[PDB]
Amino acid sequence: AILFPNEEPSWKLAKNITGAWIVPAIMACYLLVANILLVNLLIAVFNNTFF
Amino acid sequence: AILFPNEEPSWKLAKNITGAWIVPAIMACYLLVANILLVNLLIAVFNNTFF
Description:
The structure is cut from a larger assembly and holds two copies of chain A.
Chain A: H1 11-16, H2 22-32, H3 37-44
């Protein structure tokens, strides 16, 4: 939503479905809560359910 | 098999051994049952066998 301001309503948006420097930082924290916290929660909950 | 319709029988197919939009979706679910479910099953079964 930040990186494409002028995009008239389009079925193209559906197919996909100004200050860009917020975009790097809040990308990285996503990885910090995707490949760090739940994956290691999934490993913890597929290890103490085996017994 | 979807992405190469006209390929006459060939030893080339062996060396490798129309509506393409099904191809992305059923690719991703493959990763969802390759790098998510069995890898974490392998970690669970190489952790409660050590003792």
